[PDB]
């Protein structure tokens, strides 16, 4: 509980559209304007509309053979998760990467709930705020360019698989073997100008079934 109860960089978000506009899923140099809340690798998978949980990590550059990776994850969690399942609440922190006054709207969607990527129902309003889903709105020179909040565990699963899920998620076993169904804490959609880094803090963290850590090259 103590070890994991601290914020670690786990994702990055980017938006080029203003607050008062219709949110539209976009990608730019491996950065989407929405996030899948999970410490495990996530990214657009096979042209999915929104980021899904990945089964492996890839370099962003096709040449370098060096990081950054194109996939989003809590490196500290992936590199050190000596357990098979875990349970916890998630404290999320979202920070603007530069000092320009913030003006953003973020929508939190519970695990597996409808994304609702609909049009604005009223002119010049942030479509992400057009919901009863928990959403945050920060703007002005009185603000400090960041947002933080804590969400409860919302997955329909009792505990989440920390590394691998030896199975399929659908009845015709056609899904991507290795990924559990609804194994996340929901998603974060963002609109407004800027690039934002994301941190995860695992509250009341509980782990089950000890298992191997990621292998490290021999010195």
């Amino acid at each position: 509980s103590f070890f994991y109860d601290r914020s670690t960089l786990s994702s990055v978000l980017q938006s080029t559209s203003d607050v008062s506009s219709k949110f539209t899923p976009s990608t730019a140099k491996n950065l989407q304007n929405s996030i899948l809340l999970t410490p495990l690798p996530s990214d657009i998978v096979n042209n999915s509309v929104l980021p899904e949980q990945e089964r492996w990590i890839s370099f962003a550059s096709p040449t370098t053979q060096k990081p950054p990776y194109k996939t989003k994850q809590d490196w500290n969690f992936i590199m050190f998760s000596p357990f098979t399942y875990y349970k916890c609440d998630l404290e999320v922190t979202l920070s603007k990467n530069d000092r320009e006054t913030i003006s953003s709207v973020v929508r939190y969607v519970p695990c597996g709930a409808p994304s609702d990527l609909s049009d604005q129902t009223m002119p010049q309003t942030p479509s992400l705020a057009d919901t009863r889903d928990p959403h945050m709105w920060v703007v002005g020179q009185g603000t400090t360019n960041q947002i933080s909040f804590v969400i409860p565990y919302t997955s329909p699963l009792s505990v989440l698989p920390s590394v691998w899920f030896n199975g399929f998620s659908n009845f015709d076993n056609s899904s991507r073997f290795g990924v559990a169904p609804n194994a996340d804490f929901g998603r974060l959609l963002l609109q407004g100008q800027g690039t934002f880094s994301v941190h995860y803090r695992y509250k009341k963290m509980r782990v089950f079934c000890p298992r191997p850590t990621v292998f490290i090259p021999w010195p």
Partner: protein, 189 residues
């Protein structure tokens, strides 16, 4: 809002011309296939306009019994027996009466009382089940309810061959919904 979910409302059955009607037909014969088949999902197009589904669309999960009410509208001189079956998933939809009667079922005999209140027991691997879905999963689709003709509808001369059975649904006594949400918007028409 649960009060509303418990009010039996009409199911939309398909007419011979693919038109939607609140009943199905039965006559002097016993088909080798079910007269009607409803997949147990609050997402069934079959119950799309029932109060139950209308309310469920605004909630994430449900739990509890479902009541399928059948009302015989044939003549007082018409008799017959139906076998209403609820088949849990895992082995697919029941293909014969032999398969249907191997699952949960009740035999409905016509007579003085006009309707039969059938309950689809809540049989699930999970405590709650999803109200809707993109693709069917083991937590959003729970099997089928099929009504078969056990004995043919029987009657005397001077009686129309086709009898109409009204079909309705609603949540049972221990039915509940939870987690208020907004359903996929659409344009009325």
């Amino acid at each position: 809002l649960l009060s509303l979910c418990k009010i039996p409302t009409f199911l939309g059955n398909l007419d011979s011309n693919k038109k939607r009607i609140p009943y199905f037909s039965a006559t002097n014969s016993t088909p080798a296939t079910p007269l009607v088949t409803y997949q147990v999902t609050l997402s069934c197009s079959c119950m799309a306009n029932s109060m139950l589904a209308a309310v469920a669309r605004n909630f994430n999960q449900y739990r509890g019994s479902l009541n399928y009410l059948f009302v015989f509208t044939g003549s007082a001189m018409t008799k017959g027996k139906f076998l209403i079956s609820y088949t849990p998933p895992g082995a697919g939809e029941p293909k014969t009466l032999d398969q249907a009667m191997q699952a949960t079922y009740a035999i409905w005999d016509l007579g003085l009382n006009s309707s039969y209140n059938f309950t689809v027991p809540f049989i699930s691997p999970t405590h709650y089940r999803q109200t809707s879905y993109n693709t069917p999963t083991i937590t959003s689709v729970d099997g089928w309810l099929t009504v078969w003709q056990l004995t043919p509808l029987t009657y005397p001369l001077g009686v129309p061959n086709d009898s109409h059975i009204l079909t309705l649904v609603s949540g049972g006594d221990d039915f509940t919904l939870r987690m208020p949400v907004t359903f996929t918007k659409y344009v009325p028409q």
